[PDB]
Structure formats: C-alpha cells, structure tokens
Structure 1
Amino acid sequence: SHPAGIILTRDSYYTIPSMEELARSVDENGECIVNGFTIGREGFGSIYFEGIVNLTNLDLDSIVHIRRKEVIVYVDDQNKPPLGEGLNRPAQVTLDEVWPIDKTSRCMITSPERLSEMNYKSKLENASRKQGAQFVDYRPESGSWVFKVNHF
C-alpha cells in the first residue's frame, strides 16, 4: 500500500541529491523533503525542480521517463497529483542531442556553424513558446535544449 523508500533502479538514471544521500535524508516524521531536486539520465537529459520538493516514497521508476528529445513525468493523467504536489510542479527540462537531421544523408547536423546559420535555436525556442513553455537555452555542443514548464 505505502512501501517505504524512493524507487529508482534503471541504468543511467540518477538524482541530485544522490539516491544514497536521499536515503539518509528522511526526517523524524518519515518524510524526505529537499530544497532543489534533479532527476537525470546520462545520455538523454535531466529535470531540475527548484524549491522545496517532497520526495517521500516516490516511485521514480514509474513516474519519470527521460527519452531521446522527450521527457514524460506521470505516464497517466489519472496518476498525477494536484498541481504543486509531487513532481507535478514547475521544472527546468534539459534534453540532450536535440540536433536536426540532414534529410539527404540522414545523419545529424552537429556543426555549430551550420546550426547557427539556420538559426536552429530559434526553431526550438518557438516550439517551446507555442507549447506554453519558456525557452532557456540551446547549447549546440551537446545539443542541449533547455526550457521551463509550469507543471507536467
């Protein structure tokens, strides 16, 4: 019903504070509450939640999915807590390797000069804007698209 502990077991996923540190961070009431929380996945991206976040017994393996050019936080609208609770709250998403594909070669375009010339960053920025997100950055070296959302 209410099994104890944060669940995150999948390869290349990590938290900040680390899972080791979060296990040491349960308070006298039984809650794990941190000031600033990141969940990331090496090679794919990360999600930073500023402020006071209650992580108590969260099944991050079920809730969080950091994929190529996509994150999913709560797979089913029906399992999502009210706004402000859990991870359904403002966050900064970083997606790595957001590079366009050359349509002739079907290889990714990673040249910063070619990306600048086409102003690829502005394509990502307008996509963020039209989705109601706030564009933060596009770092061409790593293909890192950074944007803020108000919730998931």
Structure 2
Amino acid sequence: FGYWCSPSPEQLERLSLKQLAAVSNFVIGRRGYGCITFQHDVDLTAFTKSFREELFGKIVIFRSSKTVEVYPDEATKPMIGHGLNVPAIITLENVYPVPMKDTTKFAEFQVFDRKLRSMREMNYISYNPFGGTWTFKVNHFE
C-alpha cells in the first residue's frame, strides 16, 4: 500500500540467516508518508516468513495521522540494540501545525518549528513548511 524497502523483499530472500542478522543500509518507507533510514545494521531474522507481510504495515506502520510506529505490539519488540530497535533517521511528510497547512501564516510555522526543535526523543534535523517535511533522528524505538 505504497510501502517499500531496500534491500527489497525479494532481495532479502537471498540472504542466509547469518547475513539476515546484520543487514546493512536498510531503509523502509511508505510513499506519501515518509521513510526510515537505519543508522546501524539491522536484524531481520524475525521476519523470514514474509518480509513483505511482516514489515509492510504490521511491524512498521506509516499512518494517516502523520506518524510512524515500529513494533506497535509490545510482544514483538526486542531490546534496544536488537532487531529494528536501533538508531534511525526519519522523514515524515505532511506534518503541519494544528491542521494548519497555510504557509502565508509564517509566524505560526515558526512557533511549530520551535516546538519541533525542542523535542527530546525525536532529535530535530530539519523541517520544511512547504510540504510539511520533518526530519529527525531517534536512538531506538522503545
């Protein structure tokens, strides 16, 4: 449903269980919603059933509320440093002040932007009011 990743599901299928434990350069997104770029190797061994069915909208969910969750079921969530529970850079699209998409009210965007910048757990990287594109870094998804 717009979900994609790199290496692609069909590529991940070629990896041994040992390789799968340390997938480099893993990226997962949803077109129109955003993207997660992992900063470290990720262990995808839990998802060998079907990378596509496990990852796309179950383990990783980009929602219409302009948010993303990784491991939304607390039973599926490994410790920090394991699985996908590792540092990542995230871009979310169409993120706007309250839903106030009017760029002519620039002062209001500046208030919102300062709120984004003050976030403790979603460490600000950038925010572009023309499109509502918010980029930030997380240390994990606990």
Tell me the TM-score normalized by structure 2. 0.78
What amino acid is the match of 2:4?
A: Y
Which of 73, 77, 80 is the equivalent residue of 2:77? 80
Pick closer, same or farther for the CA change 1:109–1:38 going to 2, 3 Å.
same
Pick closer, same or farther for the CA change 1:53–1:138 going to 2, 3 Å.
same
Deviations 1:34-54, CA, capped at 9 Å, x for gaps: 212111000111111112212
Question: What is the aligned partner in structure 2 of residue 140 from structure 1?
Answer: 129
**Distance apart, 1:150 and its partner CA:** 1.3
* Contact 1:110–1:140 (Cα < 8 Å) also in 2: no
What amino acid is the match of 2:95?
A: V
Alignment of 1:65-76 (within 5 A): 65-67=61-63, 68-76=65-73
**Distance apart, 1:72 and its partner CA:** 1.0
Q: 1:114 and 2:105 equivalent?
A: yes
Question: What is the aligned partner in structure 1 of residue 44 from structure 2?
Answer: 55
Structure 1 portions without partners, runs of 5+: 1-10, 102-106
The runs of at least 4 consecutive aligned structure 1 residues that moved more than 4 Å come to none
Identity of aligned residues (%): 41
Which of 76, 80, 97 is the equivalent residue of 2:94? 97
**Which structure's residues are more often strand, by fraction?**
1
Alignment of 1:37-52 (within 5 A): 37-52=26-41
Which of 7, 10, 17 is the equivalent residue of 1:20? 10
The size of the alignment, in residue pairs, is 130
**Distance apart, 1:30 and its partner CA:** 5.3
Computing the radius of gyration from Cα coordinates, the structure with the larger value is 1
Work out the CA distance in 2 between the residues paired with 1:85 and 1:133. 19
Work out the CA distance in 1 between the residues paired with 2:132 and 2:10. 30
Work out the CA distance in 1 between the residues paired with 2:23 and 2:77. 20
Work out the CA distance in 1 between the residues paired with 2:66 and 2:91. 9
**Distance apart, 1:22 and its partner CA:** 2.2
Work out the CA distance in 2 between the residues paired with 1:57 and 1:79. 9
Work out the CA distance in 2 between the residues paired with 1:114 and 1:95. 21
* Contact 2:35–2:92 (Cα < 8 Å) also in 1: yes
- Superposition CA RMSD, Å: 2.0
Residue 109 of structure 1 aligns to a residue in which SS?
coil
